[PDB]
């Protein structure tokens, strides 16, 4: 060969390897992360992300009076000076004390001794995994990370001679590290469990760390979340000494009537993984975190003060990390605390960073979730990203409440507020900011997920399961309500989702019917526990070895296996194999006898019924094995033992056919 | 100048770029990180890394009684039972 063609192949190998290495660099630094699931519990009755979306889209104001069951002296601790507060309402999770201790194995003793932050975070993580199409029980042993933005709000009060009831568990139940650790301990996750203390920026920083961990291959999937609960009202009293809380409790984000910032509770978690991994594993992608950035301000006018320069710098860093121009995004979930000091600085930072060269007909639309539920605290950024995710999913930006007029402290004359809802060539992108009080500014950029059949198996079972019968009834009722609001779902898809993407718990039930007119009533009868024809219920055994049983005669009836021959191809193949084995030792074909072909002998004759029974039994047992039920033992009854002898492997198909046929003939 | 001369330079540039890219991959995956500064204030009168080195090298056990300038009810806290409510059984520890 010539030298030129020889060196050409080496050049081709070299440039292909160069492209591979460059692509490795690109996916090792600027990898888009996929939000495959999410779960939030925020004030205003919100329990699911859909609850959040219907709350924020409707414009509901989820601020109400202080809780009365928490032991607070609510009538006494209100004074519109020395140690009181001038606000009587904020965003609260009145069910924050509610937790399913038994489901996660937690004891009531540990549960009451445990911080409600951990209690909310466990359930939120489990729901986030479930909403991703993943079975949490199957996540055991995987290299799954856990990154929680939490803080020691104070539930056991370590500085006050911790109570007798919560003695021994006030470390395990209240260390902020254990908030992230307990998720991995219960779910059996193997990736690092790191909790982040950054005040009002911890959750978005946790999302950043999860993204970096996934990009480096340290994790396969990750839990990026935050939690905020208020065991005591001190957060209102300490921030009431300085006029930082709004007098009425409304976070008038970026409004001329901005006069303070009311705090709020809430938990919000995301289950995320690499976009390529999501595409390979066939997980549904809700949104795509393209880039992230975090920094500090440092030289701020006071420790607990903002800085427009730092916010602009983190915004630009997040834009550059994602490789996106500022004009690419058409929405921002601003922090929007509502403070008179904070709002103008944040608006100036957003205007300087994002809106500087945008078109003259596509202003940046700024809103805040804090106007609806108040300042969530640690869980603010990871709730704002959920809000933007559902805004992209539904293609409409919800309005931000309590904006009577844009605040005059900033020159808007580029960027506009979301006074009323607005609807939406290129993928939808939106930024989220989680600027903190400790100076740790954070920012993420999300993008719309990229655009992503088989014949329907008949009589697909619908499977339900729960730890307790009451939980099973609740599951049935919830599924019935969900299916009511859906335009004609595919039953086989529901069967697949229920069977694969949900844990098999102890108390189980099943619905097996081939018509879409009985499943609804069956689900209802499961809900109130009434019986139904197409409904099965039971208590699964923890352990036990399986047996196949092969009776003798008696289990015959004309037409048996006829429908299975057409419908089930595996049964047809097994019957064909049995027929080929039997042909040499008999003067007719099995398929003719089973199908009732004209002239074939009936089951009255002893010599034909027994081979037919043997073949049908062997084919059915092999079908059971094909469906994954491998027996641990086999037992027979007279001629049935021959069939058992075939399934045990002692006798080949030919030998078993010979024995049964000649034995019947004799 | 024919193709044999021409393709050799392209191959050299391509493999140099390949080496640079592989070096970059190693440089943002397993870079060695240098500890340029150190500071510590561990118990036993340690105020610097040299203090800790002197402590460990000399085989010093820096375990002493509780601090008496923190409002701790040290006398009514010993209780050698390991089960009584809100009481230790450890008299000494490494206190800064």
């Amino acid at each position, epitope marked *: 060969v010539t030298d*030129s*063609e020889k060196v*050409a192949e080496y*050049l081709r190998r070299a*440039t292909l390897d*160069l*492209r591979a290495a*460059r692509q490795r660099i690109r996916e090792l630094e600027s990898e888009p992360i996929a939000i495959i699931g999410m779960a939030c519990r925020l004030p205003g009755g919100v329990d699911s992300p859909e609850g959040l979306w219907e709350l924020v889209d409707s414009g509901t104001d989820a601020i109400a009076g202080f809780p009365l069951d928490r032991g607070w002296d609510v009538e006494g601790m209100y004074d519109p000076a020395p140690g009181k507060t001038y606000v009587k309402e904020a965003g609260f999770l009145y069910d924050a004390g509610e937790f399913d201790a038994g489901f996660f194995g937690i004891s009531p003793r540990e549960a009451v001794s445990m911080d409600p932050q951990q209690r909310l975070m466990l359930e939120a993580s489990w729901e986030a995994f479930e909403r991703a199409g993943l079975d949490p029980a199957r996540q055991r042993g995987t290299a799954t990370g856990v990154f929680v933005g939490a803080t020691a709000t104070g539930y056991v009060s370590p500085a006050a001679e911790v109570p007798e009831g919560a003695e021994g568990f006030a470390i395990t139940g209240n260390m902020t590290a254990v908030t992230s650790g307990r998720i991995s301990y219960t779910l059996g996750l193997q990736g690092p469990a790191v909790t982040i203390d950054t005040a009002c920026s911890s959750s978005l920083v946790a999302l950043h760390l999860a993204c970096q961990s996934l990009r480096q291959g340290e994790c396969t999937t990750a839990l990026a979340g935050g939690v905020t609960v208020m065991p005591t009202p001190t957060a209102f009293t300490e921030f009431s000494r300085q006029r930082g809380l709004a007098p009425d409790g409304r976070c008038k984000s970026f409004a001329a009537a901005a006069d303070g910032t009311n705090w709020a509770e809430g938990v919000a978690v995301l289950v995320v993984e690499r976009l390529s991994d999501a595409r390979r594993n066939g997980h549904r992608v809700l949104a795509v975190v393209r880039g992230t950035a975090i920094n500090q301000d440092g030289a701020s006018n006071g420790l607990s003060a903002p800085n427009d320069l730092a916010q602009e710098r983190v915004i630009r860093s997040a834009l550059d990390n994602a*490789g996106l*121009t*500022a*004009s690419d995004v058409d929405a921002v979930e601003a922090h929007g605390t509502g403070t008179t000091l904070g709002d103008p600085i944040e608006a100036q930072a957003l205007l300087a960073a994002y809106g500087h*060269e945008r078109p003259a007909h596509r202003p940046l639309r700024v809103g805040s979730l804090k106007s609806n539920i108040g300042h969530a605290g640690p869980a603010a950024g990871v709730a704002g990203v959920i809000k933007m995710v559902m805004a992209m999913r539904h293609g409409v930006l919800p309005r931000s409440l309590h904006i009577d007029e844009p605040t005059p402290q900033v020159d808007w004359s580029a960027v506009t507020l979301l006074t009323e809802p607005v609807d939406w060539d290129r993928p939808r992108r939106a930024g989220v900011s989680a600027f903190g009080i400790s100076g740790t500014n954070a920012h993420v950029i999300l993008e719309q997920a990229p655009t992503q059949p088989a014949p329907p198996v008949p009589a697909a079972p619908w499977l339900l399961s729960a730890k307790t019968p009451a939980a099973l009834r609740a599951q049935a009722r919830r599924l019935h309500t969900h299916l009511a609001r859906h335009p004609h779902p595919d039953p086989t898809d529901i069967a697949h989702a229920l069977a694969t993407t949900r844990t098999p718990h102890e108390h189980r039930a099943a619905l097996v019917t081939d018509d879409h007119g009985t499943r609804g009533p069956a689900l209802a009868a499961l809900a109130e526990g009434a019986p139904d024809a197409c409904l099965i219920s039971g208590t699964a055994l923890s352990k036990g070895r399986t047996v196949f049983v092969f009776p003798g005669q008696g289990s015959q009836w004309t037409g048996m296996g006829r429908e299975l021959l057409h419908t089930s191809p595996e049964f047809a193949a097994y019957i064909a194999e049995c027929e080929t084995a039997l042909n040499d030792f008999v003067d007719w074909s099995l398929t003719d006898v089973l199908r009732g072909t004209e002239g074939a002998p009936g089951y009255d004759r002893v010599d034909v019924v027994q081979p037919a029974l043997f073949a049908v039994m062997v084919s059915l047992a092999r079908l059971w094995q094909h469906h994954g039920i491998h027996p641990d033992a086999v037992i027979g009854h007279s001629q049935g033992e021959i069939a058992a002898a075939h399934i045990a492997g002692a006798l080949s198909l030919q030998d078993a056919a010979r024995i049964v046929a000649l034995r019947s003939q004799a | *100048v024919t*193709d044999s*001369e*021409k*393709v050799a*330079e*392209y191959l*050299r*540039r*391509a493999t*140099l*770029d390949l080496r*640079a*890219a592989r070096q970059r991959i190693r440089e943002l995956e397993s870079e060695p990180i240098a500890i340029i500064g150190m500071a510590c204030r561990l118990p036993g009168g340690v105020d610097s890394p040299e203090g800790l080195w002197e402590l460990v090298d000399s085989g010093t056990d820096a375990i002493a009684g509780f601090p008496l300038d923190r409002g701790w009810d040290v006398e009514g806290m010993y209780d050698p039972d390991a089960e009584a409510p809100g009481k230790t059984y450890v008299k000494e520890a490494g206190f800064l």
Partner: antibody, heavy 118, light 114 residues
Framework: EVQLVQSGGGLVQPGRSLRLSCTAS????????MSWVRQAPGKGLEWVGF??????????EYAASVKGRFTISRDDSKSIAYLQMNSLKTEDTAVYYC?????????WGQGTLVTVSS | DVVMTQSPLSLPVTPGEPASISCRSS???????????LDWYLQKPGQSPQLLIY???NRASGVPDRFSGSGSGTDFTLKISRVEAEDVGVYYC??????????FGPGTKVDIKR
């Protein structure tokens, strides 16, 4: 690190000779064919001429307008290249760049200015 | 027989918009080996030229990742993800299939748009 530094440029009278030196460091000088490219003050880059490696014979090719007058040499013991101009013309005023690679000019020198006029 | 190449003589840019220089050859530059013998160089104002792209698509090491060449046969284009102020200068796309090459061509001036 690859580094090319040029020297010897400046003013010269018409019809006189000059020697432009190009020092290379950070890589094997012998392997790379060395080229000289002149940019006139106003015009684009113009390829003066190049020299192959020692293994390929070190043959030197030149542009049409600088044939015979100009010559190229190299010494790999000290890893230097030399462009010897003879009978310089007024139009030869330009910035000359030394570039490793005969065909692919993957690296360029800092550029040395030369002026010819009486 | 000599292969000519034509490109735009100017292309104003902005700090952030994607720019795109274009080049059209007078002959099929696709070698029998299956390579486009094209090279893009950049001469910044008052600085030595440097290699941007070689063999049409391959990006030279040390060049910013924003630059990227593409095309085939006779039509080629160099794209910048986010044009910077320092990216202004002169861009020379020029073939390497046919030799000797007398000149680099008029190039392509780049300047800030206003």
């Amino acid at each position: 690190e690859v580094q090319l530094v040029q020297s010897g440029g400046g003013l010269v009278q018409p019809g006189r000779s000059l020697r432009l030196s190009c020092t290379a460091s950070g890589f094997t000088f012998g392997d790379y064919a060395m080229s000289w490219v002149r940019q006139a003050p106003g015009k684009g880059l113009e390829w003066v001429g190049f020299i192959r490696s020692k293994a390929y014979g070190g043959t030197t090719e030149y542009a049409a307008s600088v044939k015979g007058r100009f010559t190229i040499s190299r010494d790999d013991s000290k890893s230097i290249a030399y462009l010897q101009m003879n009978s310089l013309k007024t139009e030869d005023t330009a910035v000359y760049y030394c570039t490793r690679g005969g065909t692919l000019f993957d690296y360029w020198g800092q550029g040395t200015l030369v002026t010819v006029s009486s | 027989d000599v292969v000519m190449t034509q490109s735009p003589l100017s292309l104003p840019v902005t700090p952030g918009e994607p720019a795109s220089i274009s080049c059209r050859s007078s002959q099929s530059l696709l070698h029998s080996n299956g390579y486009n013998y094209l090279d893009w160089y950049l001469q910044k104002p008052g600085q030595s030229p440097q290699l941007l792209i070689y063999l049409g698509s391959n990006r030279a090491s040390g060049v910013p990742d924003r630059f990227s060449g593409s095309g085939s046969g006779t039509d080629f284009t160099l794209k910048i993800s986010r044009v910077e102020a320092e990216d202004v200068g002169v861009y020379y796309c020029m073939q390497s299939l046919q030799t000797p090459r007398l000149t680099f061509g008029p190039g392509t001036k780049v300047d800030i748009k206003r």
